[PDB]
Amino acid sequence: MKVWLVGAYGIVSTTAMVGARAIERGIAPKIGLVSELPHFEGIEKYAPFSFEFGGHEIRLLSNAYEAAKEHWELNRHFDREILEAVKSDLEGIVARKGTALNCGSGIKELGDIKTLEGEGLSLAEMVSRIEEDIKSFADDETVVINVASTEPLPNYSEEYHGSLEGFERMIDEDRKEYASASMLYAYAALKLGLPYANFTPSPGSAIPALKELAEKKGVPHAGNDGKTGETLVKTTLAPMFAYRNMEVVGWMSYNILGDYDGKVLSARDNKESKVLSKDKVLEKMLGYSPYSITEIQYFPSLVDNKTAFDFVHFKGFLGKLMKFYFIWDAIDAIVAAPLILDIARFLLFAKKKGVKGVVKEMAFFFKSPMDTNVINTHEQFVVLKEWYSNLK
Amino acid sequence: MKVWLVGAYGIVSTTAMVGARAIERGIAPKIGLVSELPHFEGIEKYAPFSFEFGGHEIRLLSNAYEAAKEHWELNRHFDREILEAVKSDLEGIVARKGTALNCGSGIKELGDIKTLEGEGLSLAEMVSRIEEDIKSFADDETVVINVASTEPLPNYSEEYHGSLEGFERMIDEDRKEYASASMLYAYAALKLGLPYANFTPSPGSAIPALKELAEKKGVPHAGNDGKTGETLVKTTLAPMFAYRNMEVVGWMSYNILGDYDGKVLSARDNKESKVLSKDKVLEKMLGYSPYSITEIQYFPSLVDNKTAFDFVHFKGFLGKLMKFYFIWDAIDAIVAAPLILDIARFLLFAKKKGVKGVVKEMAFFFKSPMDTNVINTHEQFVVLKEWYSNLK
Amino acid sequence: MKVWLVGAYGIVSTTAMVGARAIERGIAPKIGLVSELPHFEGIEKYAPFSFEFGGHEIRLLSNAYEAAKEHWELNRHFDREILEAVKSDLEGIVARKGTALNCGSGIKELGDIKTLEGEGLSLAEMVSRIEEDIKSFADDETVVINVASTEPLPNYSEEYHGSLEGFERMIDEDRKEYASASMLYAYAALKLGLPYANFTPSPGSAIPALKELAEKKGVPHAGNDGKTGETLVKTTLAPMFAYRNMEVVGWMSYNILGDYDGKVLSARDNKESKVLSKDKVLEKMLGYSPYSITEIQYFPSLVDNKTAFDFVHFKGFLGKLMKFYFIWDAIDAIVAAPLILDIARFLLFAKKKGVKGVVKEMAFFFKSPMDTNVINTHEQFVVLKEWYSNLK
Amino acid sequence: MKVWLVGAYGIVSTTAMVGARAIERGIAPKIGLVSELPHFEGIEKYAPFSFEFGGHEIRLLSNAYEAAKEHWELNRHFDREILEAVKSDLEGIVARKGTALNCGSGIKELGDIKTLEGEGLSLAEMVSRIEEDIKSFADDETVVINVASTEPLPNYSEEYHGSLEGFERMIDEDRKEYASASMLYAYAALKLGLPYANFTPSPGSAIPALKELAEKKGVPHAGNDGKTGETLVKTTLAPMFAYRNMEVVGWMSYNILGDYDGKVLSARDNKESKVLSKDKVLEKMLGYSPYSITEIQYFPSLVDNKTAFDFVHFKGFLGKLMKFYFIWDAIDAIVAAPLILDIARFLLFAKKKGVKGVVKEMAFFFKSPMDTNVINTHEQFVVLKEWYSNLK
């Protein structure tokens, strides 16, 4: 199959590229891959473990191997012998110039970038480069996945976002003020009839205009925002307190990381998309809102080794309060990269099975799942198991 | 309804007594009570929030109020104004002299005790005092719940434990070597046709002899071992790692507490029942055994404020290892006492609905659930919800 | 002796009042009191354990007992029987109306307040009420200690703060823009010849104008900012890494609390004084600056039970990095209140021994010690021991 | 200089070998080396950074490079490029066959071993091989350092250990029952006039017989037991509580590690030396004994990445209790290896400066310092600074 990756040279994207190839050459286990659990046997009939990559980037380096080695140099999150083995394959992967349109102040923190909007292109001219890049790569087994730096909350507009006819009116009128890059790549992929997922809290295809386009074109799509570590624990453990009829009176979630993700998120406008996504799950699960605080801070020594400190204060019998603390220490790229490969395969499955529009049953992968109030990790895992069985 | 409590003067038992009454007088919330969740509406038709207490003890103090105040003095785990309000009610609760038969070396740590076996009674003569105590209290809405100090692993015997006819042959032959107190109280309650639950890792009714008696007499029973804090988190979080296709390579669980429970468990023979119960859940959920360590140590300054430190080392994509840590800080009596009241009400429900034998669907309350391989907290909560709906 | 307390109805101030009296009535141990360590035997010759209180407040409640009970109701940080025992004594303590001049936006969070500036008084008229209040209370064994809500960083001015003649020119010209309440109370106390300490990161007497006045008047003074929990651990543990020739590459300090202190500090202008004070100690001890982050967030369920999460990332032999984590769980009022009593006694000692100006050797009590680069807790404790011996 | 290392192929020993050479070839920083702090400038006049190695082992592998690579393969605690750079140097280091005489049951856990006692040699014949090995290597700038697996507590004997004349009577009588390997290597080194340090809690030279021999021969010696991580924090932080007049009511120290050290310590007899050494520091610093628990457990996934969980429960003002928690995550070999090089250089310094007998002023390096009640890390660091200045 083919995966077009937005933000192709990022750490999640390149680790997924590295892992795909290492697994295919026989030199790495299949750990981490949900699509490889026993419940999903038979998936290889529809979406075999077999990948070619392309993508869009704004940080142009020469190819995906150079990009993979840069992140590896700082992180050493897989073995040198893997990097060497997949070098040749990755050196053949060369990203194309994307758009950082309205992606917030945090993009400054990436250093040397080049973008389509920086060439003076109108929105319509931009959309055409993007589509030309994707379609020249795409086949009948291609999916597009956004792994780009998180954008800030967009300037929402009813006219331009609330219908597909209004969204295309935006493009025709070149009204950039209301377009963000994640929407343009989503639009390009759905217009081309490719399945799409959004791994980030950017809006992507999560506006009605693009949901309406997905249904009309008969294309499945999924999102938003990879739920990979601290928020995974949150949607696993919060349920325990409800099962036992306990009130959660406060939940603190404090995250510190470095590398390119922590750097963009060091900016206040970019940080807000991610924080809101992480914060808001509590109410949806419990029915009420405990005093929550969720923060992300840059901490460069940690590089991609994001660490999360959480504290949960909660009331039990007779009203007495009590305390639970947890600390999560993981490489972000390691818990996210297999999910990119899972999402790609499940999208292809859903595509081959006639599924259109939001695949709400992929909520399990995401912090902010489209079209569903199923947040609980256990329930999400049941829904995804059952969804697959119903279509298999 | 009536609850006969084995270990009536313990902290869990007295906190439950205090809480029952405080709730009934209107001065405490219903937090902590599973049986008060919205899914279980209508339960009050079969098991209203309404309790009278009695029980067996070996530490004879004058009454349940003196016993409640002693634990309160050290713990202050509810307000003085609650203690004052429920004083009169508790002063009417007076335990009867039980048996500490073969309850292990740790019983020395309780100080001044008096027991039936210490009076020279045969097993048959013991069983008769126990039954006479219980039946003089019991009505058609009575349940017996074991909350006594944890016993060591028993000397298991096929003849004497593997059939009801062999168990009664033990009693007739006065073969004490093979009887433990928890089995004698279980036997007494089931012989009398009362529902029984075991809140501790002692054997209780979890031997075939007594399971066979429960079916024959048509009595429901449940157990074993309240799953209340660290093991609750364990059966909630371990699933997350399986959902994501991660290998758990080691799990450490280190617990330190004081008061009467930590004191009995300071003994190596008594400690083993509890440790095995806490340890063994991992395999049952995951399919394989990570390197696990589970310890309990006395730490007197903590009194009933058991604190648990856990560390989970686990492999993800590409085999890279990663770390999760958690610390649990709660009053044991506070997370256990509402469950005693829940178990009592659910037993009465099950009784009134024609249920006999092990109520496997009460696994949610227990670390070592009888007759079931459902360990996962989420699944256990679904089974209990569904069980109730099917009988309501 | 007498202690005039600025912020008399706060939690630290009232807990110190409660504790003083409980100790004097014989019903509480002397734990927590540095001045009661064996090295300081003989101090009772100069500063016996014997206290009368008065003070300034802007939250006017009826008396110090009402104020003590309000904090106790939420915190229960000492026993009911103590509160009852010291009730009569505290009911005789009635604060006088102070000034919240330029104390930042966070003062809104205290609710109902009344202030001298709110009466239209000029600076000179304000200074006169303050001095009249203090002098009508003061004797030859009186000290004034600021325990008021933390102010923001002041508008610093060379003319008005850099000399005593320029500071009094400010008062004569009624130039409020450049005066903050903490400076006015410091000025009032030093003008009256009373020793002064500042327990907060407000400026207080830490401007040259007031240091010059302290020397001229021959009055000892100390500050700034009680070092009581997380920053105490910081100045104790950071040294370990230097002793062992390790580079600290990052130190995160994340604090969450509620009650009146967390509420005022929830405001960004007020928060900054405290954060800078907590943050800046690292460089002073180590010689260089690790990447540090220090945050304070409101978390109301915790009330005065401030909890601190810290993480220290550090390099060792061969450059390999490594991790230390700590979590501090304490009642702020409990670790601060005995130090108020210690500071008062040590000030009186220093006064009776002819000491004038900044008592730099009291650095041990403070996060931002005036006139000293001795930050290390061990060194600070040696300096204070030696200082006392040299004057005893 | 030369360092003879007992347990030459262990992880601490080989990491120190690797580091020495990497530093000398210019490719690693001097971080971790106390002897490289600015206070110790001029030490290179007496003990330059310049090392040749030899040693005794019972696990015979071909040479020190093979041994270094085995630990590296599991731990990756320095870079591959370092291992490659120092390969040739280490391949020239070949250990000689030592003695595991009375080293406890845990030695079984090392797998394939060969020993002098296994050849049938008497004690006197053993002592002669050891001395012949050491003296054929030794020069006027040689030191012997024990880094061997921890032994159990020895069978102490007044006759055979309480005097040098009684110790040699043991050797003459071939009374093995009373000799342990660590004493034999200590004896061999001091008889040969070499300085000796003991990095482990084995007895080594810490018996009067050998202390008396050190004085008589005029040889300096130091020990016992590298204080490197959790116990370093303990002797740094415990003082804070005394400085502030707080009672420590309980301290739990729970350690889990794997590799060869955790494996030997998995045995109950070997574990006890280390646990007692770690536990007993509290009383010596504070004056009294808090309820302490100190445990070490094998946890193989962690290899040499020992992790320590500690909890400190302590009383403050008014008697209110409060909690501090810490977690230490470090590679044991990384915090210990530079200290071997420091100890060697400081021993040579002390030797060249006429120092004889126990160098009590090296207590800073050790958990159980000989001939001193100075336990506090700060005081220990002052003593070592001052000692060096006095002799420089």
Ligand SMILES: NC(=O)C1=CN([C@@H]2O[C@H](COP(=O)(O)OP(=O)(O)OC[C@H]3O[C@@H](n4cnc5c(N)ncnc54)[C@H](O)[C@@H]3O)[C@@H](O)[C@H]2O)C=CC1
């Ligand atoms: N555990 C994880 O790593 C999870 C990551 N995320 C999100 O996934 C995304 C990727 O994470 P990382 O790889 O760690 O960050 P990264 O910064 O290393 O990778 C993002 C890449 O996208 C490129 N990029 C940014 N904006 C672009 C645009 N508009 N068009 C084309 N390329 C663009 C950047 O040059 C960079 O190479 C981030 O947005 C992050 O918030 C979401 C949940 C969890």
Ligand SMILES: NC(=O)C1=CN([C@@H]2O[C@H](COP(=O)(O)OP(=O)(O)OC[C@H]3O[C@@H](n4cnc5c(N)ncnc54)[C@H](O)[C@@H]3O)[C@@H](O)[C@H]2O)C=CC1
């Ligand atoms: N969170 C919790 O508190 C949980 C508790 N458990 C178990 O529940 C039991 C009760 O816990 P606590 O109330 O904390 O302990 P506790 O020691 O305060 O209460 C037990 C009481 O039972 C009495 N007793 C002991 N053996 C007896 C016997 N053979 N016959 C009659 N009375 C006897 C003792 O005198 C004592 O009053 C313990 O076995 C504990 O292991 C199980 C899971 C969790």
Ligand SMILES: NC(=O)C1=CN([C@@H]2O[C@H](COP(=O)(O)OP(=O)(O)OC[C@H]3O[C@@H](n4cnc5c(N)ncnc54)[C@H](O)[C@@H]3O)[C@@H](O)[C@H]2O)C=CC1
């Ligand atoms: N561990 C601790 O509790 C430490 C506290 N601090 C500082 O000590 C101070 C006292 O702490 P808490 O008692 O917890 O806070 P609190 O808010 O309960 O007490 C402060 C009191 O001062 C009053 N106040 C505020 N501004 C005033 C003014 N300008 N004039 C007169 N009264 C005024 C308020 O009405 C309040 O009653 C805070 O500034 C805090 O930052 C410093 C280090 C540590």
Ligand SMILES: NC(=O)C1=CN([C@@H]2O[C@H](COP(=O)(O)OP(=O)(O)OC[C@H]3O[C@@H](n4cnc5c(N)ncnc54)[C@H](O)[C@@H]3O)[C@@H](O)[C@H]2O)C=CC1
């Ligand atoms: N942070 C640390 O690594 C600290 C280590 N220690 C002690 O330092 C010692 C070394 O630690 P590691 O290198 O981690 O362990 P390791 O087991 O990898 O190294 C010990 C080596 O000594 C050899 N050995 C054992 N007994 C011997 C004997 N009687 N004669 C000659 N060789 C013998 C073994 O074959 C092994 O190669 C251990 O005793 C440990 O308890 C003490 C404090 C801290």
Ligand SMILES: O=C(COP(=O)(O)O)[C@@H](O)[C@H](O)[C@H](O)C(O)O
């Ligand atoms: O999106 C998330 C959060 O997902 P979670 O790890 O909370 O499940 C992460 O990628 C995020 O960028 C940082 O790791 C976090 O420290 O802010």
Ligand SMILES: O=C(COP(=O)(O)O)[C@@H](O)[C@H](O)[C@H](O)C(O)O
């Ligand atoms: O039975 C348990 C364990 O249940 P868990 O809190 O692990 O779910 C507790 O009652 C036990 O006695 C101690 O709290 C534990 O420290 O040993």
Ligand SMILES: O=C(COP(=O)(O)O)[C@@H](O)[C@H](O)[C@H](O)C(O)O
């Ligand atoms: O001044 C300090 C800090 O002193 P430290 O406890 O850091 O030694 C505290 O009073 C502060 O107000 C909060 O507790 C902290 O969470 O911001």
Ligand SMILES: O=C(COP(=O)(O)O)[C@@H](O)[C@H](O)[C@H](O)C(O)O
């Ligand atoms: O000797 C010690 C303890 O020194 P500490 O790290 O406590 O300062 C260590 O080498 C020990 O072998 C283990 O790391 C510990 O987990 O038992």
Ligand code: NA
């Ligand atoms: Na860690």
Ligand code: NA
């Ligand atoms: Na806590």
